[PDB]
Amino acid sequence: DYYHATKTTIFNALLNTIDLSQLAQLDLKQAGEEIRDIVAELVAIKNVSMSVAEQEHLVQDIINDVLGYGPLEPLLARDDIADIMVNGAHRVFIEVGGKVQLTNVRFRDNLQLMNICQRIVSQVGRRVDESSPICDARLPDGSRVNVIAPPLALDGPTLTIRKFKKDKLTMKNLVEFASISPEGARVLGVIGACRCNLVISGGTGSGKTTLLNTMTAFIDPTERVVTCEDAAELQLQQPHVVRLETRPPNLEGSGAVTMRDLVKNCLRMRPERIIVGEVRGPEAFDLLQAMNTGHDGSMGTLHANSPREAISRIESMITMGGYGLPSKTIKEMIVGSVDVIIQAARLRDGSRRITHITEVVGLEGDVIVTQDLFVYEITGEDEHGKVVGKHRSTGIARPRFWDRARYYGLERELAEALDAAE
Amino acid sequence: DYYHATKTTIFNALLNTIDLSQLAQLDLKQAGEEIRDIVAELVAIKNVSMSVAEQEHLVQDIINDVLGYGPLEPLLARDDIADIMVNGAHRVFIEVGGKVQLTNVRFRDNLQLMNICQRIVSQVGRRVDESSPICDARLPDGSRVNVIAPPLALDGPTLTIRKFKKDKLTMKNLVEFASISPEGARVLGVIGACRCNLVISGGTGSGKTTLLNTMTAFIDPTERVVTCEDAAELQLQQPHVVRLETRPPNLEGSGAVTMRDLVKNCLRMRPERIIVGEVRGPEAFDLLQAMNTGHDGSMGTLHANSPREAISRIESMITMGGYGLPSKTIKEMIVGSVDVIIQAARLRDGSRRITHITEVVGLEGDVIVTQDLFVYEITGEDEHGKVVGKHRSTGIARPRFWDRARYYGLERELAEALDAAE
Amino acid sequence: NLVEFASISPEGARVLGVIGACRCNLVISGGTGSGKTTLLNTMTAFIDPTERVVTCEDAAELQLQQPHVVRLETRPPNLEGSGAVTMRDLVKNCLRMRPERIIVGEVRGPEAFDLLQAMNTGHDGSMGTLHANSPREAISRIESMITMGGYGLPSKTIKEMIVGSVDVIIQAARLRDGSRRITHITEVVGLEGDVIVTQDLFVYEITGEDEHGKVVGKHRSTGIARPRFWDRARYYGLERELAEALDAAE
Ligand SMILES: Nc1ncnc2c1ncn2[C@@H]1O[C@H](COP(=O)(O)OP(=O)(O)OP(=O)(O)O)[C@@H](O)[C@H]1O
Ligand SMILES: Nc1ncnc2c1ncn2[C@@H]1O[C@H](COP(=O)(O)OP(=O)(O)O)[C@@H](O)[C@H]1O
Ligand SMILES: Nc1ncnc2c1ncn2[C@@H]1O[C@H](COP(=O)(O)OP(=O)(O)O)[C@@H](O)[C@H]1O
Ligand SMILES: [Mg+2]
Ligand SMILES: [Mg+2]
Ligand SMILES: [Mg+2]
């Protein structure tokens, strides 16, 4: 259509007609209004039979390309979308109703896509380029974006976006999805109420954050919880909750406040619980402190595929913190601090389930001893292809945290659930 | 030679007529359009007897030396040659028909060759010199260039070009070469379509990558595929494929993006199948994770002579990377993740055979149990062939992956091929 | 010349030729001055001329006869501690030059690991020189070097890798009277636990000294009918020579 040619011609000229440094210092509406005059002037020269609505659409497209996120803006806005995949300048896919399908949109050039990705990542403050070719981030709106640079992606820089979900799941939803048997839900309720230190371990996309949210839903409302995340993904209904959020290095690369700083400050604002949005770095150390140095009941979420692996990664993180503690000391601290290690994993069929509810019970010489209260045994593959399994207790009638249950009167509930779940 | 002598005489005058640095000052991508006239106009400026037929060849050679890649040009241009290899200004070998062969072509001097290689690599943007004698790059043409500088290669500058084979063997070709019997071909087809996890073991140059490509040929077009190759070798026809390639560490030991660093990201961009060009280290772990963390149907390739060798080697690779997982856990992960292992070997006769198609069923005593389905049996040795060509199905009705085959509706072909294998 | 100096019996020479042609991952071992470099050069003289061989030598010593050899030499940290192209980097690059055999001049440290990978990952027929007094001591040194590489490799993993990659070890020693002899031709046979089991196809046995003080000894075979690498010989049709040599040794 003549509209596309007119837009291309106007763009090829307005670049040298409007100074970028002037619009760069204005909000989206201000920049669009300023560029409206430039678009009108361009239309005046070599004018075409374009309607006012066509001019407005062209101005919106110019704003999206120069300042927005290019041909994605029409799609990103749409709510029907679940995921957006690009994997090349000339191809873009969308997930609708659980089915991926091609789209009619595309970028002018893979360099346009590259700079669009750079803009999107910069919105979080990270950098993607030939020296830093891979960038994963979670946007403030909550959607996740992963981009990879040409030096690795032979087909040009590749981009993927997964849009933030409006509604979170609750323990009832997990029970109905069979991610955890109802007795497992009861035991989780006991563990959450009884202020047992929690490390929800899992793998990528394995539902860790959802478990953390559902568990924190069990906290006594009176307690002063201090959420601490890299992004605003936790929603707590408790009345007294303080939500923090780290800030990464920006521009020159200063003003950053890492998770460790936030936790170390949390220690000095008398929080009943600390709920770390995710543990990746030395903060684990400062988190493990205040799991036992008061603030009992703090929770964290961690990326590991097995409770043994989770403990190993905690030890590795603490060691990398530079505190130079002996490995024996680190193991002792872990044993003394961590009480429960829930593990959420995704199975072959794609469903997500809580494979282990492990409980750290002691340190034997060199190895931490872990006794599992709930374990998920996979029977096999159903007729329909969906993996099928059953949760079962280990028969423990008095887990380590039993004492804490006695503190809150939940001893009977725990005893009932433990034996009834087998 | 008369032609070479005349060309050298003409070039001696041309270099003065058009300064050597003059072309560099001009746009090298289009400066040749000028020098071509200089040689064309008043051809034989030295008044050297020649003919138009030979004059055209002389002018083309002069242009190639001045602008092109000199004597290397036909080699690159010709399609018959897969690999070019230069050990110095004197000796240059090519690869054709699967065999190496010396060639009559040679360069005038080491400085000429060094300039040629510097130009060829710089076209990608990298630089090779005494400061950085080593150099590795991938050209836009789909080729890999490795260059070593004289300060290291005592014989002189060393160069190796590995071109991307345009035509990969189709499955019909493999059937024709008796590599796999038609029943084996159908079993492979069902396995590929049935979204079974593959590990294509093979011997040195036993055709692993070609087998992997012909296997990918079976993927449903709608499924997202994220190809992660050490070196671009695969060629997929699916509409929705994504190609990734690692980067070796710079000579300073920086900028490296190892395989695991790629597959870990592959986990995060919603793939349907992850395909690893060659699993050769701790990256295997991550792949196996993605093998069972959903994404079922991923296919990686490994170097080994027997399926048992391949699986033991995979355990070894997993235990690297400092992950420190128990061997029992590694075996459990492997049995739960991998489904089918295919072993292909190059026989003494010079041909290649898909020697094994086997299935993993479990440990049954901490020793992974491999149940072969298709075996290549050598009834004996031909006096001059030493090859028989017998592919036999072990029977074994209802292989472990039978249920998935039924789910996808390929049960008919699986039964028809596994049975009536001969 | 080596046969003339009785350093190896003709049967030993034939077995060595079999190993060289049969693409067995060799590791020449021997004390300093044992001529191990000379032995390595002679062994390379047996490689098939078509095969492409890349020579990564810390200092130029080898002189191959084949027509398709690429010679490489390391660099010291000339640039004030920088610019050091260590042997390990050279081998890592050689892995990307599609060579048939990688002939390391001498293995002194981390470069061993990658070399082993070369043997395990396609480049069969690779060779190398190691400074050692006994084949077992040589294997221990190789494991130690791999560990020194800094890779977080459990000792069991390194032992298994050595088992699966190496195929032959040749021991060359300078004897008391200043002569050179080849003492052992062993073949790593597997990891049967926490220790690497080893076979010995060819051995040298001393008996005493002559009237002039010269040590007296002779070579013999262990009678192993089929060495581990026997299958490789089948690949290149070297069964007959291997059997004949291992049988005629005694
Ligand atoms: N048990 C479950 N059943 C069904 N859907 C689930 C279940 N658990 C999680 N989900 C869905 O899967 C996604 C879970 O993502 P979640 O935020 O938990 O990931 P994460 O572990 O925080 O991720 P990452 O490790 O990549 O940062 C959401 O879409 C959630 O709706
Ligand atoms: N089954 C086969 N029969 C005949 N030739 C084959 C077969 N498989 C591979 N080849 C040839 O061997 C060459 C190497 O194959 P490829 O798999 O790319 O390397 P590698 O064997 O090292 O993985 C290819 O160019 C191909 O033509
Ligand atoms: N079998 C042998 N008999 C006699 N002299 C030998 C023998 N092997 C090596 N030499 C002599 O030893 C010298 C150095 O040996 P060399 O290969 O440098 O050992 P290394 O590599 O351990 O230093 C050579 O110059 C050679 O003349
Ligand atoms: Mg999360
Ligand atoms: Mg290959
Ligand atoms: Mg020496």
Short mmCIF file of C-alpha atoms in Angstrom, two decimals, chain C residues 2-243:
data_model
loop_
_atom_site.label_atom_id
_atom_site.label_comp_id
_atom_site.label_asym_id
_atom_site.label_seq_id
_atom_site.Cartn_x
_atom_site.Cartn_y
_atom_site.Cartn_z
CA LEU C 2 68.34 -47.69 16.94
CA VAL C 3 68.22 -51.37 16.01
CA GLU C 4 71.95 -51.14 15.29
CA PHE C 5 72.54 -49.77 18.80
CA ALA C 6 70.47 -52.73 20.08
CA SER C 7 68.16 -50.26 21.83
CA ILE C 8 65.28 -52.33 20.41
CA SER C 9 65.13 -55.75 18.82
CA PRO C 10 63.83 -56.08 15.25
CA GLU C 11 60.62 -57.52 16.68
CA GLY C 12 60.29 -54.40 18.80
CA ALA C 13 60.90 -52.26 15.73
CA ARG C 14 58.12 -54.04 13.87
CA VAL C 15 55.71 -53.68 16.79
CA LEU C 16 56.56 -49.98 16.98
CA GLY C 17 55.83 -49.64 13.28
CA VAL C 18 52.48 -51.32 13.87
CA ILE C 19 51.66 -48.86 16.64
CA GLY C 20 52.68 -45.90 14.52
CA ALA C 21 50.65 -46.90 11.49
CA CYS C 22 47.76 -48.32 13.52
CA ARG C 23 46.89 -44.88 14.95
CA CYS C 24 47.39 -45.68 18.63
CA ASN C 25 47.57 -42.76 21.03
CA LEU C 26 51.21 -42.94 22.12
CA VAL C 27 53.00 -41.33 25.02
CA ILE C 28 56.78 -41.70 24.90
CA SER C 29 58.22 -41.78 28.42
CA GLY C 30 61.80 -41.64 29.62
CA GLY C 31 64.37 -39.86 31.74
CA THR C 32 66.05 -36.74 30.45
CA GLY C 33 68.56 -37.48 27.73
CA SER C 34 66.93 -40.84 27.05
CA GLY C 35 66.53 -39.75 23.44
CA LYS C 36 62.75 -39.74 23.81
CA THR C 37 62.59 -36.95 21.25
CA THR C 38 64.63 -39.07 18.83
CA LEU C 39 62.38 -42.06 19.45
CA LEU C 40 59.36 -39.87 18.81
CA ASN C 41 60.84 -38.58 15.55
CA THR C 42 61.52 -42.11 14.35
CA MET C 43 57.97 -43.14 15.25
CA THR C 44 56.50 -40.20 13.35
CA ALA C 45 58.50 -41.41 10.37
CA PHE C 46 55.92 -44.25 10.23
CA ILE C 47 52.78 -42.11 9.85
CA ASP C 48 50.86 -42.38 6.60
CA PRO C 49 52.03 -39.51 4.35
CA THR C 50 48.47 -38.51 3.44
CA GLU C 51 47.50 -37.89 7.06
CA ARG C 52 47.93 -34.30 8.19
CA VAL C 53 50.04 -33.87 11.32
CA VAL C 54 50.51 -30.69 13.36
CA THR C 55 53.69 -30.49 15.42
CA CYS C 56 53.31 -28.42 18.59
CA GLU C 57 56.84 -28.37 20.01
CA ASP C 58 58.00 -26.07 22.79
CA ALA C 59 61.31 -25.77 20.94
CA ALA C 60 61.90 -26.92 17.38
CA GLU C 61 63.45 -30.38 17.66
CA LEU C 62 61.40 -32.73 15.49
CA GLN C 63 62.14 -33.11 11.78
CA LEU C 64 59.37 -35.06 10.07
CA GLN C 65 59.65 -36.54 6.60
CA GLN C 66 55.98 -36.50 5.62
CA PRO C 67 54.84 -33.96 3.01
CA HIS C 68 51.84 -32.56 4.93
CA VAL C 69 53.25 -31.58 8.32
CA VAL C 70 52.44 -28.23 9.92
CA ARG C 71 55.09 -27.09 12.39
CA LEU C 72 54.16 -24.89 15.35
CA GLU C 73 56.22 -23.52 18.22
CA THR C 74 55.06 -21.93 21.46
CA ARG C 75 56.03 -18.46 22.64
CA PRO C 76 57.32 -17.30 26.02
CA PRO C 77 55.72 -14.43 27.95
CA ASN C 78 57.75 -11.93 25.95
CA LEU C 79 55.25 -9.06 26.30
CA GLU C 80 56.20 -8.33 29.91
CA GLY C 81 54.37 -11.41 31.13
CA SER C 82 51.74 -11.24 28.36
CA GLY C 83 51.43 -12.61 24.85
CA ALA C 84 52.44 -16.08 26.03
CA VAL C 85 51.11 -18.63 23.53
CA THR C 86 51.38 -21.65 25.79
CA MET C 87 51.36 -25.21 24.50
CA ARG C 88 47.79 -25.58 25.75
CA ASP C 89 46.61 -22.75 23.51
CA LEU C 90 48.46 -24.24 20.56
CA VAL C 91 46.80 -27.63 21.06
CA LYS C 92 43.38 -26.05 21.52
CA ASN C 93 43.83 -24.28 18.20
CA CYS C 94 45.13 -27.43 16.53
CA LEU C 95 41.85 -29.06 17.46
CA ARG C 96 40.28 -26.56 15.04
CA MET C 97 42.69 -27.16 12.14
CA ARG C 98 41.21 -30.62 11.37
CA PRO C 99 44.53 -32.47 11.78
CA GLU C 100 44.75 -36.24 11.69
CA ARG C 101 47.49 -36.46 14.34
CA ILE C 102 48.68 -33.93 16.90
CA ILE C 103 52.33 -34.51 17.78
CA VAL C 104 53.16 -32.57 20.93
CA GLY C 105 56.89 -32.00 21.28
CA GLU C 106 56.74 -32.53 25.03
CA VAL C 107 53.96 -32.57 27.61
CA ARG C 108 54.84 -30.54 30.69
CA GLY C 109 51.55 -29.42 32.23
CA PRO C 110 47.96 -28.47 31.44
CA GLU C 111 48.51 -28.95 27.71
CA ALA C 112 48.20 -32.66 28.49
CA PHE C 113 44.47 -32.48 29.19
CA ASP C 114 43.56 -31.01 25.81
CA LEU C 115 45.92 -33.42 24.09
CA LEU C 116 44.07 -36.29 25.73
CA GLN C 117 40.81 -34.85 24.45
CA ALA C 118 42.37 -34.76 21.00
CA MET C 119 43.05 -38.48 21.30
CA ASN C 120 39.58 -39.15 22.68
CA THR C 121 37.67 -36.74 20.40
CA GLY C 122 38.64 -37.93 16.94
CA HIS C 123 42.34 -37.23 16.46
CA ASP C 124 43.42 -40.83 16.79
CA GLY C 125 47.08 -41.49 16.16
CA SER C 126 48.22 -38.50 18.20
CA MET C 127 51.55 -38.69 20.01
CA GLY C 128 53.46 -36.89 22.73
CA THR C 129 56.63 -36.86 24.79
CA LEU C 130 56.64 -37.10 28.57
CA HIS C 131 59.47 -37.09 31.11
CA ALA C 132 59.04 -40.13 33.33
CA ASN C 133 60.96 -43.07 34.73
CA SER C 134 58.29 -45.79 34.62
CA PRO C 135 55.03 -46.18 32.68
CA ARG C 136 53.08 -46.21 35.93
CA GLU C 137 54.98 -43.12 37.05
CA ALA C 138 54.28 -41.59 33.63
CA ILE C 139 50.54 -42.12 34.07
CA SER C 140 50.69 -40.63 37.55
CA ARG C 141 52.48 -37.61 36.09
CA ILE C 142 49.81 -37.23 33.42
CA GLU C 143 47.07 -37.29 36.03
CA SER C 144 49.00 -34.75 38.09
CA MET C 145 49.38 -32.47 35.08
CA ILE C 146 45.69 -32.66 34.25
CA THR C 147 44.93 -31.77 37.86
CA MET C 148 47.39 -28.88 37.66
CA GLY C 149 45.31 -27.68 34.72
CA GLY C 150 42.93 -26.25 37.32
CA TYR C 151 39.84 -27.97 35.94
CA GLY C 152 37.54 -29.11 38.72
CA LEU C 153 37.96 -32.73 37.69
CA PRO C 154 37.61 -35.47 40.33
CA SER C 155 40.61 -37.77 40.32
CA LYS C 156 38.38 -40.65 39.25
CA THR C 157 37.27 -38.66 36.21
CA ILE C 158 40.85 -37.89 35.20
CA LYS C 159 41.86 -41.52 35.63
CA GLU C 160 38.91 -42.63 33.51
CA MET C 161 39.77 -40.08 30.82
CA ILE C 162 43.37 -41.27 30.70
CA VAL C 163 42.11 -44.84 30.48
CA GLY C 164 39.79 -44.06 27.59
CA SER C 165 42.16 -41.81 25.65
CA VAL C 166 45.71 -43.16 25.88
CA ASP C 167 46.50 -46.49 24.25
CA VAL C 168 50.27 -47.06 24.43
CA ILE C 169 53.20 -45.94 26.56
CA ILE C 170 56.81 -46.44 25.50
CA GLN C 171 59.59 -46.20 28.09
CA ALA C 172 63.09 -45.18 26.97
CA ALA C 173 65.89 -45.10 29.53
CA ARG C 174 69.58 -44.25 29.48
CA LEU C 175 71.33 -47.16 31.15
CA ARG C 176 74.26 -47.12 33.55
CA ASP C 177 76.92 -47.49 30.85
CA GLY C 178 75.46 -44.49 29.00
CA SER C 179 73.60 -46.58 26.42
CA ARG C 180 69.95 -46.06 25.52
CA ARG C 181 67.38 -48.85 25.74
CA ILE C 182 63.62 -49.19 25.39
CA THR C 183 62.37 -50.84 28.56
CA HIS C 184 58.58 -51.07 28.35
CA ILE C 185 55.81 -50.99 25.75
CA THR C 186 52.63 -50.98 27.84
CA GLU C 187 48.96 -50.48 26.99
CA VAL C 188 46.55 -48.90 29.44
CA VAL C 189 43.88 -51.58 29.76
CA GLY C 190 41.27 -49.93 31.97
CA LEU C 191 40.34 -48.49 35.35
CA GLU C 192 39.51 -51.46 37.59
CA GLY C 193 38.81 -49.33 40.66
CA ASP C 194 40.79 -46.42 42.05
CA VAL C 195 43.94 -47.62 40.24
CA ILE C 196 44.75 -47.89 36.55
CA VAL C 197 45.53 -51.43 35.45
CA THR C 198 48.24 -51.76 32.82
CA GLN C 199 49.49 -54.49 30.50
CA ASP C 200 53.01 -54.92 29.17
CA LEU C 201 53.43 -56.34 25.67
CA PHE C 202 57.18 -55.77 25.36
CA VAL C 203 59.77 -55.65 28.14
CA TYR C 204 63.54 -55.43 28.54
CA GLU C 205 65.35 -57.69 31.00
CA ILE C 206 68.92 -57.17 32.20
CA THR C 207 71.18 -60.06 33.18
CA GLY C 208 74.43 -58.48 34.40
CA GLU C 209 77.57 -56.85 33.04
CA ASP C 210 80.20 -57.96 30.54
CA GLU C 211 83.94 -58.12 31.13
CA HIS C 212 84.22 -54.49 30.00
CA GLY C 213 81.46 -53.46 32.42
CA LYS C 214 78.83 -52.94 29.73
CA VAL C 215 75.40 -53.98 30.95
CA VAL C 216 73.91 -56.99 29.15
CA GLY C 217 70.21 -57.45 28.50
CA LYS C 218 67.63 -58.51 25.97
CA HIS C 219 64.03 -57.84 25.02
CA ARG C 220 61.07 -60.20 25.29
CA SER C 221 57.30 -60.24 24.98
CA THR C 222 54.74 -60.94 27.67
CA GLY C 223 52.95 -63.42 25.40
CA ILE C 224 49.78 -61.33 25.19
CA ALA C 225 48.13 -62.92 22.16
CA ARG C 226 45.80 -59.97 21.50
CA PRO C 227 46.75 -56.55 22.91
CA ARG C 228 44.04 -54.03 23.69
CA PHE C 229 44.69 -52.15 20.44
CA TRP C 230 44.31 -55.37 18.43
CA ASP C 231 40.99 -54.15 17.02
CA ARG C 232 42.68 -51.02 15.68
CA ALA C 233 45.06 -53.24 13.72
CA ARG C 234 42.04 -54.95 12.18
CA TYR C 235 41.00 -51.50 10.99
CA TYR C 236 44.25 -51.05 9.05
CA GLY C 237 44.83 -54.72 8.26
CA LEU C 238 47.86 -54.99 10.55
CA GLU C 239 46.78 -58.17 12.34
CA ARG C 240 49.40 -60.35 10.68
CA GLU C 241 52.42 -58.18 11.47
CA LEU C 242 51.33 -57.61 15.07
CA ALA C 243 50.76 -61.31 15.68
#
